[PDB]
Amino acid sequence: AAESSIQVKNKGSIKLSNVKSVVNSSGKLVITSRNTELKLIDEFGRTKESYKVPYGAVLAKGDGEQVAGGETVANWDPHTMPVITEVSGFVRFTDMIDGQTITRQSSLVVLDSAERRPALKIVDAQGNDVAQYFLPGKAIVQLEDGVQISSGDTLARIPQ
């Protein structure tokens, strides 16, 4: 079941618990909490389905609304866990080494721990200092410096 889409059997209002509200590039929000709870309340307090939503997921419909059922209410990458940006603006890259920590596929790898993870905060506008960015093995960032990326958005992380 590689499809990350989730179906709703019956028309029950979605209730989200144990979640962190983060503003994304759109009206939807991204959950940064690993443990999340989903419940359905159609006409009474009895819950119907539970499911499970991992970290870094985008909900299709807002919390507390009554979904008609049969349609996905939250979508996420079923293979990669995105890391949201706490600061909106240009991406600040520290110790950018070419030929050793660069893998052309722009989409370029960040660094390799075995080959060598500098941490820097996202710039406010161009290079202003405002958050620690951790780069594990095979971590790749497709956003170059000065991309002016908004908060709540993440490129492919390429898990090892």
CA dist 143 and 135 (Å) reads 14
The experimental method, as deposited, was cryo-EM
Sign of CA dihedral 56, 57, 59, 63: negative
Helix/strand/coil (H/E/C) assignment for every residue in the chain: CCCCCCCCCCCCEEEEECCCCEECCCCCEEECCCCCEEEEECCCCCCCCCCCCCCCEEECCCCCCECCCCCCCEECCCCCCCCCCCCCECECCCCCCCCCCCCCCCCEEEECCCCCCCCCCCCCCCCCCCCCCCCCCCEEECCCECCCECCCCCCCCCCC
In total, the chain counts a number of residues equal to: 160
Of the candidates 20, 42, 40, 39, the one whose C-alpha atom is nearest the C-alpha of residue 29 is 20
CA dist 141 and 143 (Å) reads 6
